[model samples]
Target: AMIEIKTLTNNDFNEYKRLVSTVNEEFTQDSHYSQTMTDTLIHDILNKCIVFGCYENETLIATAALEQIREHKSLIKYNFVTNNDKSINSELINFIINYARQNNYESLLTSIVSNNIGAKVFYSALGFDILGFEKNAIKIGNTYFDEHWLFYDLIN
Candidate 1:
């Protein structure tokens, strides 16, 4: 598949909604649903951040959002890869990292549910260090899951 990356705009709302809904559904069987996709949350993300999507032959396969939460840091507040393919996910992350670096961000941050070893390893492999851990950071259906905050330094 030909992979193309582009900045997501308001016009891409439907595709964004579809992608998130699918990802969220897949997360239901996990230890905890770390993030839930809702219309309100989707709207907020689109309005508050610059989103980028990866299209595989014109189909939206992955997405990641960049939100500048601090002068020197940006947050990858939301990212999803429909098939959880490592290469595709890595490509998306690299794209976000380059974008943040070009914008002069000193670092990039992302969080993963404590039990998601796949994500922990993926980000760590990309040089993202665990900055902190939060207990009971996410709740779903009366169950709580901790979260690990990871960061990649853009500057030494």
Candidate 2:
């Protein structure tokens, strides 16, 4: 099966919101993201972020959200999937690398739970290097998890 990468709009986000929201681990596997993805929250973010959705035969199966939260860096606020497809990371990185180049971003930034070995390997395999660490970066249901900050410098 061949999948193509594309940008997402509000209408698509609405049509696939329920299905796509849970496709990521944060909603499916983790309990720490205390805030819900409310309509207003989604609306606000949609205005500020550049979203990429990977589709199979026109059906969205993977996604990631990248936003230029800083002057020279775009942040990957969410990353995950329906099939553990590494291609999601590939498309996402390639998508944003070009986006960053056009927008003059120096790098792309993201973070992963310190204990998530699979996520660490996934990002590392995609060429993201650990930039730093955030102790107790998130508190979900009284459990604190440290996060490793990772980035892919555009100059590389």
Candidate 3:
């Protein structure tokens, strides 16, 4: 398999931009937010989070972020894969899981907007537990949206 996962850096910025452009429409329709994906945002992400990119034949196909929440907990953010390919997504998540475990994290956490059924199912299949829900967790323009909190235990 040619799929590879690596930590993203500024050098990979252009590829990340292309990857987002490919999936932006449908993903944003899920409306986690109307947040614009700008050059500045990408720069900020590179600086603040440990972002991982999945590449196939040297082209970035997916991206996700691992953000330290505290001493032993990490959060997964911006999980996106082209065509929403489950296999690719799974590999990416697993890579992050192993990476976090290696770094001594006790657990991995991620949140899904209430209406993104696909994301919820994908993480569930990967053995992430439904920890709880947050009401009106995100607001877009006029209406609010809820989200489900989930975690995968790594203590074992």
- What residue runs in model 1 are displaced by over 4 Å at the alpha carbon? 25-32, 70-72
Q: What would the per-residue lDDT of candidate 1 be over residues 1-156, giving only the tens digit for each residue? A: 579999888788899999977776322125335467778777777773799989988789988888877434577866777777779888889888888889878888887877788888988988899899989776766777778988898996
Measured by TM-score, how close is model 2 to the native structure?
0.82
* Tens-digit per-residue lDDT, 29-85, candidate 3: 264454346899787787737999888887888888888764446888766678877
> Please, what's the RMSD in Å of model 1?
2.5
| TM-score for all models, in order of appearance | 0.88, 0.82, 0.87
Which RMSD values do the candidates have, in order?
2.5, 2.8, 2.5
Name the lDDT value of residue 6 in candidate 1: 91
Query: Candidate 1 local accuracy as lDDT?
Result: 0.78
lDDT, candidates in the order shown? 0.78, 0.69, 0.78
Question: In terms of TM-score, which candidate is strongest?
Answer: 1
Ranking by TM-score: 1, 3, 2
lDDT of 1 at 40: 79
For each candidate, how many residue pairs have backbone atoms clashing (under 3 Å)?
Answer: 0, 0, 0
